[PDB]
């Protein structure tokens, strides 16, 4: 268990150092996306919440292929604006319901320290 609290202000600084095995030790779900919304990292707790096998979704497009329910102004729209603006820091509640039991969560989207990468953090509410 990596001790990082959800919503921590310097969270992007802390996760820069972690490799994929260390990300799996977090208490919350973590998804790293590129600016086109392709999945670069997907940790163990996220596969717990969503039922997806982390290895099988890396490389897929989150908005197109994996999670069509987030293809809406309320989620995807915020991402596209953060990517275009080059800055992103937003938290909101949402319901995941594609091919799974409808599940309410707290989502935290934030730009990653690194280049063109963005974080999507998820925890149950």
Give whichever of 66 and 113 is closer to ligand HC4, judged by the CB atom.
66
Number of residues that bind ligand HC4 (CB under 6 A): 12
Does residue 29 contact residue 102 with C-beta atoms inside 8 Å? no
Q: Cα–Cα distance between 111 and 101 in angstroms, integer?
A: 29
Q: Does 22 bind ligand HC4 (CB under 6 A)?
A: no
Residue ranges in 50-79 that form contacts with ligand HC4 under rule CB under 6 A: 50-52, 66-70
CB of 66 to ligand HC4, least distance (A): 5
CB of 71 to ligand HC4, least distance (A): 8
Residue range at the interface with ligand HC4 (CB under 6 A); choices 18-26, 35-43, 45-53, 108-116: 45-53
Q: Does 43 bind ligand HC4 (CB under 6 A)?
A: no
Q: Cα–Cα distance between 45 and 53 in angstroms, integer?
A: 10
Cβ contacts of residue 114 below 8 Å, gap of 6+? 16
CB of 13 to ligand HC4, least distance (A): 26
**Which string of DSSP letters, residue by residue, matches 84-119?**
HHT--EEEEEEEE-SSS--EEEEEEEEE-SSTTEEE
Considering only residues 5, 27, 100, 125, which one is a binding residue for ligand HC4 as defined by CB under 6 A?
A: 100
Q: Enumerate binding residues for ligand HC4 (CB under 6 A).
A: 50-52, 66-70, 96, 98-100
């Amino acid at each position: 268990m990596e001790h990082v609290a959800f919503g921590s202000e310097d969270i992007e600084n802390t996760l820069a150092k972690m490799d994929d095995g260390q990300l799996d030790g977090l208490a919350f779900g973590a998804i790293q996306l590129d600016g086109d919304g392709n999945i670069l990292q997907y940790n163990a707790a996220q596969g717990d919440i969503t039922g997806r096998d982390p290895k099988q979704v890396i490389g897929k497009n989150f908005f197109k292929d994996v999670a069509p329910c987030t293809d809406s102004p309320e989620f995807y729209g915020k991402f596209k604006e953060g990517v275009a603006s080059g800055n992103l820091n937003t938290m909101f509640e949402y319901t995941f319901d594609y091919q799974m039991t409808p599940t309410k969560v707290k989502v935290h989207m934030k730009k990653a320290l690194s280049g063109d990468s963005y974080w999507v953090f998820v925890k149950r509410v």
